[PDB]
Ligand binder design. Structure first.
Ligand SMILES: Nc1ncnc2c1ncn2[C@@H]1O[C@H](COP(=O)(O)OP(=O)(O)O)[C@@H](O)[C@H]1O
Ligand SMILES: Nc1ncnc2c1ncn2[C@@H]1O[C@H](COP(=O)(O)OP(=O)(O)O)[C@@H](O)[C@H]1O
Ligand code: ALF
Ligand code: ALF
Lengths: 195, 216, 257, 32, 216, 257, 195, 27
């Protein structure tokens, strides 16, 4: 009946496509990533310590005091989904910082990989350098209070926006939308026939 | 229809039984046909060939007219289901709308004097109820050639009565090809007769002549 | 006279819902079975190998490590094991001049593709709800690998269905053929613990390559073993599909009675 | 353990009685 | 036989269909019986009850005479086998020696005008060959009460001819209970008639009276 | 009028040979299958666990360690998995007033008991020929354990056959129920390597007790694990047989159509 | 039909029963066993060395020279199957000695168990003592030129014939003969009916 | 634990009642 006219494709295929394109090419803001690869040697225990500490709240407090992350992360007024709204809760800021700085651990070699996303190419490298330096200081102070940081690949200065992926996301969400359209159409035909 | 040259055999263990060889027979037109045959002949095989159930492997048949599916006494239906979903499937298989499908299903239930047993799975029908449902379905759809394989041999007098009533309500636009072993029925249900023997097929205009050829 | 494509669509739709009421069942036990059996298996492996997996590699968690290899494997398993009766159990319906065996083998495939897509979507939703990773990092590669897995599995099912019509015993064969495939494909456990000296015999299983590629394209840090590629499963799927269609067309008229 | 052994023996003997009785009942009722 | 009180129902989804209730009917003696019934009645169910295929659950039947197994048109045989092993099984099932078994098998092949098709699996028989084999097997064994369920409806004239010849060679010591829908046959094949309707069963001496009650 | 025992003997004999031509097959492939599949499995396990077995315990050799637990296990497996169709596949024959479902379930059991006894005898002969131990040290205990295994297995098969008549899907259940039983029973590998903390769940499987008792009564130095006894499987067999006969007699008249 | 006509029962069941009973209860001779349990400690390697050496031909030569085993093992004239015929091949004598002295190894504890069968109760214990002493001497010589023997349970003097088991073998033998009788009867019925 | 033992006794009682009722229904 109502969910049987042609509008159903516009319900799932067309309008999500239109809103996705308007956001991705008109509203979105570039997010340059900077990648560094580090490790700790003198093994797994101290690397796990560092992996936990990088996402810790105290490091976020130090970085906010030193680079003013809260002011910078709210500079893109155009992007409505990826800006840090003023007056937001501290827990949301911690979640945002945890979502930006991506830390990956390799099983075989035990190499930490830090990918830091910033809205300015120099800012991402500066944040990566600050993270590496403060992590090294924490490893020294921690061990000394109770080791060194080996930087395999230093922070790099990006040139183009590795994120967000416009055409990639558009294509995969288009594929998902037609899959859901087919499933919903099959279900709707089943209800409309067995009634 | 033309029924051009064909060869029909089956993969028997003892070589191959060539049931039909070089059959080039042209069926008559605008008359009901009665297949008499005998045991060991190919009436049912020829019946399926007319219905397009299995294609010839060493031949072909030209049919420039709509052929209804064979009725028979076994096969053509789906078990473990009630007749309701079967008739919905059979009206859906020919690409129909909802109104015609519903009215044709209603005609199917109206023709068959079946009560609650219409809402029972295909296992729990007698030998007559399934034949009655199939026969009512045969005249439900609009065709030209109605294929009957002794589908009344398991019916009562009222079954024959309203089947004859329905057919006489639908005469003038369609004809019937039927095979049965009760020739009192085929005497008054057919115009010309066809006898098949030793794979060979022959046509007989006079019904009594075909009966005598059967018993000859 | 309507086009043959329209009558194909009508035949496929009619066979679809027809197959639905029996595959799902009138008792409504089919849905509970197919969303209670997978979680039961998930709970089993985890309870028996959580410590072993955490020892093998701690980068990703077991409940999300196994689902992404299990549900596609279950999908392929079902569409290779239910196409056996797509013709044999549907033999009595081959009396309406339009129904063909290819329709009955691909209608069941469409049905179970829809069913497993639904179970995958709901499983990803509930796994994100429980607090686990549920977004594929490279979703396009996962979609492509799933498509080639569907091609290979449907081709193998069609070939087996065409071959098995003479001897219905072959069910048992695929059943025993279904035992090592659940184990040798590395769905339950990562292939890290497999000794290298045995590795070639593992590399001859296309479903192992497909599961490894799905896991690599889903997680952001899964690493493939050397020798695992996409050329082998794609070529296998193409050649198998050619030979399956080749066989079906050779014995099309015998697909009756 | 006199009482435990006696109870176990009684249970097993009753089960043997049941098995023999149903076997005999089947072998006698099958005659039709 | 006595056919004492009984109750027959089936596990239908809509409660339970009590097909037979409190039936206390004494069959006649030394006369062929013709069951007419109707669609929806229990002729086949009563037929199986006479053959002891399924025992009554709320009743019993006293039969102090040997009853042959029902013939019917479906069931009672084993598929995927030739008729040869089937007839060896059926003569072995009654505890027979080798000579009588072999001669009775030979009689089975002699009665049925079947050539190489006798050495073919049960799948590759027509609707008439299986009935012919079953009917020849029915008069192979020595009994008193021969149970026939329209087993000729798929036979030719020669089938009826030599079946009548065999029966007239075996009259005087056995009687036949038959059900069929062609009452030209039951008029000359039976002595008294029995009509069942709404579960109730009734007996009619005159065959014409039973026919009129059928069509009444 | 002959006694009902004589007609039982005639019915059982007629059903015996009848079942023989189809279980063995007219192609004579049944015998080659049932004496080529066991040796194929034997070659498989040995090739994959000879070193593991020699590390676990070197007192006895693997080719004779596994056969004595495999062939009785295969016998029980077959007589629990082929009695499913003893009635369903033989349903069309229930029209001669003398054939009863109990006859058709026990005739198949007698047939396969004979078949597996033959395969056991020929396997012991060929294993003695190849130069391995082939004389049971305490043959009477092995015979008793085999008898109680037959009792338990036939009882379970009869109970399952009585229950499954309404829903023929149950095949699949026993099939999946057949997967852990081949592994959790310890037929492939000795139970020495099993961690003690898991041991109670292993001790709840009667077939594990029966296989362990057969191995202990066959070899002269096999040692049973603590908790393994004969009271549990004997009581299980007796109670299961009582409940199976109890069910069959409850639903005897419904075993038709 | 010659295999049939009730002579088949005598063919497999009766006549094997009579022959066994006549030779088992009248012809047979007692074989007293003597059991000792030893080990080597100072592990698995030396125990395996001893297990191999006990069945070695050189030890059999020394024992034949010291105790005259060949003369004694041929003393029971009544038993036809278990006597060492005079003039037999030396390989058959080695096989006979290997069949008599039974050596078992326990996996968990590594304890050798030697069961020596003699036709006289003193002879079995004497042979066990000689085997233990010569094994200890061999171990000491191997340790010195290229260790000690720990006797957990010393050789014991038997009182009754643990071997052969008359009723045990008879009962199990009849059990097997009836099983073979049933199988052969079923096969014969199959051939005589399918013909 | 009152309710725990009560529930266990309820399960045991239901099982034994079903078994005894079925056995009596046989004979
Ligand atoms: N599935 C099959 N396999 C092999 N042969 C078959 C098969 N079906 C039918 N036949 C053969 O084809 C012939 C067709 O006869 P049929 O037309 O059924 O007889 P009727 O006309 O009396 O019904 C039969 O003689 C049978 O031997
Ligand atoms: N397997 C079954 N399950 C349930 N009901 C059945 C079953 N078989 C037959 N019945 C019912 O019993 C009745 C028996 O009718 P039947 O005697 O076969 O008719 P006829 O005398 O015309 O052959 C039918 O109306 C049917 O509904
Ligand atoms: F099943 Al009938 F007459 F209706 F035999
Ligand atoms: F012999 Al027929 F229909 F099969 F007359």
């Amino acid at each position: 009946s109502r969910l049987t006219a042609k509008r159903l494709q516009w319900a799932l295929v067309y309008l999500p496509m239109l809103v996705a394109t308007v956001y991705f090419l008109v509203f979105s803001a570039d997010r340059y990533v900077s990648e560094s690869v580090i490790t700790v040697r003198q093994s797994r225990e101290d690397t796990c310590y560092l992996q936990t500490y990088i996402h810790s709240m105290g490091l976020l407090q130090k970085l906010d005091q030193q680079l003013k992350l809260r002011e910078h992360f709210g500079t893109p007024l155009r992007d409505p989904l990826f800006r840090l709204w003023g007056g937001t809760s501290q827990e949301w800021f911690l979640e945002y910082y945890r979502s930006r700085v991506e830390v990956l651990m390799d099983d075989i070699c035990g190499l930490l990989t830090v990918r830091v996303q910033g809205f300015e190419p120099e800012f991402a490298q500066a944040l990566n350098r600050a993270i590496l330096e403060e992590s090294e200081r924490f490893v020294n102070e921690l061990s000394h209070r109770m080791k060194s940081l080996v930087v395999v690949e230093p922070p790099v200065l990006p040139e183009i926006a590795e994120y967000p992926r416009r055409w990639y996301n558009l294509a995969t969400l288009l594929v998902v939308c037609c899959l859901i359209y087919g499933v919903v159409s099959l279900v709707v035909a089943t209800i409309r026939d067995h009634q | 229809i033309e029924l051009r040259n064909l060869t029909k055999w089956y993969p028997t263990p003892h070589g191959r039984r060539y049931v039909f060889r070089n059959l080039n027979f042209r069926f008559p037109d605008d008359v009901s046909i009665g297949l008499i045959g005998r045991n060991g002949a190919g009436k049912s095989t020829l019946m399926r060939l007319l219905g397009g159930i299995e294609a010839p492997n060493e031949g072909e048949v030209v049919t420039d007219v709509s052929i209804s599916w064979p009725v028979g006494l076994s096969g053509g239906f789906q078990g473990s289901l009630t007749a309701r979903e079967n008739v919905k499937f059979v009206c859906r298989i020919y690409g129909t709308s909802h109104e015609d499908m519903l009215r044709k299903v209603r005609f199917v239930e109206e023709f068959a004097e079946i009560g609650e047993h219409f809402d029972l799975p295909m296992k729990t029908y007698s030998s007559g109820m399934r034949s009655r449902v199939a026969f009512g379905l045969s005249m439900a759809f609009d065709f030209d050639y109605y294929l009957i394989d002794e589908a009344m041999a398991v019916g009562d007098a009222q079954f024959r009565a309203k089947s004859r009533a329905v057919f006489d309500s639908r005469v003038g636009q369609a004809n019937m090809i039927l095979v049965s072993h009760n020739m009192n029925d085929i005497k008054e249900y057919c115009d010309v007769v066809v006898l098949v023997d030793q794979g060979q097929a022959t046509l007989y205009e006079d019904v009594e002549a075909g009966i005598a050829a059967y018993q000859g | 006279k309507r086009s043959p494509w329209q009558i194909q669509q009508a035949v496929l739709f009619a066979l679809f819902l027809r197959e639905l009421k029996t595959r799902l069942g009138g008792r409504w036990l089919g849905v509970f079975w197919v969303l209670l059996e997978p979680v039961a298996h998930i709970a089993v492996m985890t309870t028996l190998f959580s410590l072993a997996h955490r020892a093998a590699m701690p980068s990703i968690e077991y409940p999300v490590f196994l689902i992404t290899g299990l549900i596609p494997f279950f999908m392929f398993r079902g569409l290779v094991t239910r196409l056996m009766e797509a013709i044999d159990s549907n033999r009595g319906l081959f009396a309406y001049r339009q129904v063909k065996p290819i329709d009955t083998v691909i209608a069941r495939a469409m049905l179970e593709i829809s069913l497993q897509s639904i179970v995958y979507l709901i499983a990803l939703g509930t796994l994100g709800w429980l607090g686990f990773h549920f977004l594929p990092v490279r979703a396009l590669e996962l979609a492509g690998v799933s498509a080639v897995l569907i091609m290979l599995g449907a081709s193998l099912g069609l070939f087996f269905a065409v071959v098995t019509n003479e001897i219905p015993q072959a069910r048992a064969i695929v059943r025993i053929s279904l035992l090592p495939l659940y184990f040798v494909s590395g769905v339950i456990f990562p292939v890290h613990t497999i000794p290298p000296q045995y590795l070639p015999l593992l590399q001859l299983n296309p479903v192992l390559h497909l599961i490894e590629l799905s896991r690599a394209s889903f997680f952001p840090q899964y690493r493939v073993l050397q020798g695992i590629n996409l050329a082998y499963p794609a070529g296998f799927a193409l050649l198998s599909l050619f030979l399956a269609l080749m066989l079906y067309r050779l014995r099309r008229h015998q697909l009756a009675s | 353990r006199r009482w435990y052994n006696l109870a176990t023996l009684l249970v097993v003997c009753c089960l043997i009685y049941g098995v023999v009785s149903l076997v005999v009942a089947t072998i006698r009722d099958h005659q039709d």
